Design a binder for these strands. Structure first.
Ligand SMILES: Nc1ccn([C@H]2C[C@H](O)[C@@H](COP(=O)(O)OP(=O)(O)OP(=O)(O)O)O2)c(=O)n1
Ligand SMILES: [Mg+2]
Length: 426
DNA sequence: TGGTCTCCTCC
DNA sequence: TGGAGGAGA
């Protein structure tokens, strides 16, 4: 198998939170700007950065005071604060706009707030039967890059738009259109549809996005990041060997952490391509049966993880960190914040019930204690029977009350997390 | 480092 | 009728 059975796209919103704030406030459009939370501490922590601001070296998690040193004219929008904490409602509602448009075209898997995988196989087939064997014009692909192209010989390729076009021209001239079963053709038609999905998103919301088109989710996701912002990339099966030959392992989705580090360390390699020299059994012996098989196929551009038909979140939660000296040290402090979180949760749950005809049946409560390395010190669950903040906050307190070893609380709490899960039809 | 989150696997 | 952790938005 060559892993060419599907056409898969991944659509990803450009500097998402920034665009949401720029739509609402025209003064921020086409300028260096960032989205911050909690203005009183070092100007706020940056959570999203415009491309104009990135050119100055501004990144996520920079304090805005520090970002102003790199970019003096940097403009800022603040996350809404409600019930004593950052509130992301605006961005979740903006997300809904985008997901709904995309779901008119095909089955989506909502992977995050601002990205969805699209399974385009069927849409591609139908379109190929509609076209009537007609040639594909370059005008149908005005923002598409073909990864690996242009190659060979040929005052045009000096500028980026010039390169894109020569690349696209070479691809289209070489396309055999008379055969409806050609994976390259399928991908091309898949890219035509994504141009239309992206045009629809921009028309109906004003947000711009990037997209990757390939044969699986991982290559689609890799493809998408190759030409940002506001552009889409086709990564064909044939492009993989050259692409993978200098592709750092950590750039592939799910290899950005400890597992990716172990591949590099154990095998003595740098690049995704280098993985081809190892047998499936060799990879299985190092990283386990599932990862080993996954890597064997992946380094050859083959992956089988399906686009799951799901556009609603499986969990609805909210949390607050209480770092250093702000750590919660009294029973009444703990009960107060549990109530704030519960109240926001109640509102979001109630909305979710009316919107999507479903109820959460489990409440998960998670905490961190001061001086614990781990990201969580304790997760406990209970039944969620009523969408009632007072009940949910009191029940949350019950199940964690045993952690106190002192009405003082010790050790102090650095984190609270309430999460509603286990949805069933209502 | 940061902060408010979601999805997944392992045992 | 679970809880810890990894990996990413
Ligand atoms: N660690 C993170 C990552 C993301 N986000 C939020 C803010 C982002 O705008 C949105 C989407 O995340 P992306 O990783 O897609 O980043 P952007 O959309 O901001 O930039 P890009 O244009 O590179 O996708 O999720 C966040 O709060 N914290
Ligand atoms: Mg994005």
């Amino acid at each position: 198998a060559t892993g060419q059975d599907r056409v898969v796209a991944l659509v990803d919103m450009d500097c998402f939170f920034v665009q949401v704030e720029q739509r609402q406030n025209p003064h921020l459009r086409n300028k260096p700007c960032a989205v911050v939370q909690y203005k009183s501490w070092k100007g706020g922590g940056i959570i999203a950065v415009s491309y104009e601001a990135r050119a100055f070296g501004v990144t996520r998690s920079m304090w805005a005071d520090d970002a102003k040193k790199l970019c003096p004219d940097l403009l800022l929008a603040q996350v809404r604060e409600s019930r004593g904490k950052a509130n992301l409602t605006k961005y979740r509602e903006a997300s809904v706009e985008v997901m709904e448009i995309m779901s008119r075209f095909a089955v989506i898997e909502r992977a995050s707030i601002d990205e969805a995988y699209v399974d385009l196989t069927s849409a591609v087939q139908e379109r190929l039967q509609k076209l009537q064997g007609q040639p594909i014009s370059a005008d149908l692909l005005p923002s598409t890059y073909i990864e690996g192209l242009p190659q060979g010989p040929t005052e045009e390729t000096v500028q980026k738009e010039g390169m894109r076009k020569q690349g696209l021209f070479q691809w289209l001239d070489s396309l055999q259109i008379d055969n409806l079963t050609s994976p390259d053709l399928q991908l091309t038609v898949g890219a035509v549809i994504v141009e239309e999905m992206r045009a629809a998103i921009e028309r109906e919301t004003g947000f711009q996005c990037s997209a990757g088109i390939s044969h699986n989710k991982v290559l689609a996701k890799l493809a998408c990041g190759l030409n940002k912002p506001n552009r889409q990339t086709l990564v064909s099966h044939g492009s993989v060997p050259q692409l993978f030959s200098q592709m750092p392992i950590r750039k592939i989705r799910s290899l950005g952490g400890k597992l990716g580090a172990s591949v590099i360390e154990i095998l003595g390699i740098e690049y995704m391509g280098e993985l081809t020299q190892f047998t499936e059994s060799q990879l299985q012996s190092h990283f386990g049966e599932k990862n080993g098989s996954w890597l064997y196929a992946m380094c050859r551009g083959i992956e089988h993880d399906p686009v799951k038909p799901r556009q609603l979140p499986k969990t609805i939660g909210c949390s607050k960190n209480f770092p250093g000296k702000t750590a919660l040290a009294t029973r009444e402090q703990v009960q107060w914040w549990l109530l704030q979180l519960a109240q926001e949760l109640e509102e979001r749950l109630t909305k979710d019930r009316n919107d999507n005809d479903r109820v959460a049946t489990q409440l998960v409560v998670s905490i961190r204690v001061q001086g614990d390395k781990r990201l969580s010190s304790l997760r406990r669950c209970c039944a969620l029977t009523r969408y009632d903040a007072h009940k949910m906050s009191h029940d949350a307190f019950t199940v964690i009350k045993n952690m106190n070893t002192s009405t003082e609380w010790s050790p102090p709490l650095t984190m609270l997390f309430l999460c509603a899960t286990k949805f069933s039809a209502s």
